[model samples]
Target: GSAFCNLRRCELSCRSLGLLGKCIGEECKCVPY
Candidate 1:
């Protein structure tokens, strides 16, 4: 489903948390590294 998700914002946040950031179909997901 198409939604509102900031890819770059998510990426930065994930990186800050030491996790991998991914955007799946407009959804920001934080993946454990």
Candidate 2:
């Protein structure tokens, strides 16, 4: 129940992959915001 994932970092990565994620506290599962 904490966050270590960098949202901006994750988003940049996600953009390259052409998708997005959610709940940065955990796994960045592909889910539209």
Candidate 3:
């Protein structure tokens, strides 16, 4: 489940590269911009 977050992050980065952007700190989540 640890490295799985890497795959999930890749997915998030995909979205981040698209309509959303990357969020840093705490959870380092992604958001739509």
Candidate 4:
């Protein structure tokens, strides 16, 4: 059987957005804030 992983990617993207408040507009690094 095969599985799709785009949801995982969306979750990661959500994490990225949450960490930074927004995930674009600048080249930023992530850390515990």
Instruction: Give a tens-digit lDDT track for model 3, residues 1-33.
Output: 243245445446658466453333323455555
User: What Cα-based lDDT does every candidate model obtain?
Assistant: 0.80, 0.64, 0.48, 0.41
Question: In model 3, which regions exceed 4 Å deviation?
Answer: 1-5, 17-33
Runs in model 4 lying further than 4 Å from the true structure: 1-5, 17-33
lDDT per residue as tens, model 2, 1-33: 657877666676666666774536756656554
Better of 3 and 4 by TM-score: 4
lDDT of 1 at 8: 74
lDDT of 4 at 6: 42
Q: Which window of 10 residues has the lowest lDDT sum in candidate 2?
A: 21-30
Best-to-worst order by lDDT is 1, 2, 3, 4
lDDT of 3: 0.48
lDDT of candidate 4 over 1-33, digit per residue (tens): 223434434446557655522223332244344
TM-score of each: 0.56, 0.42, 0.28, 0.30
Q: By summed lDDT, which 10 consecutive residues of candidate 1 come out lowest?
A: 1-10
Predict model 2's lDDT versus the native.
0.64
Error of 4 at 33 (Å): 18
Cα lDDT tens digits, model 1, 2-27, are: 57777777788798888988876787
TM-score of 4: 0.30
What are the clash counts of all predictions, listed in order? 0, 0, 0, 0
Scored by lDDT, model 1 comes in at 0.80
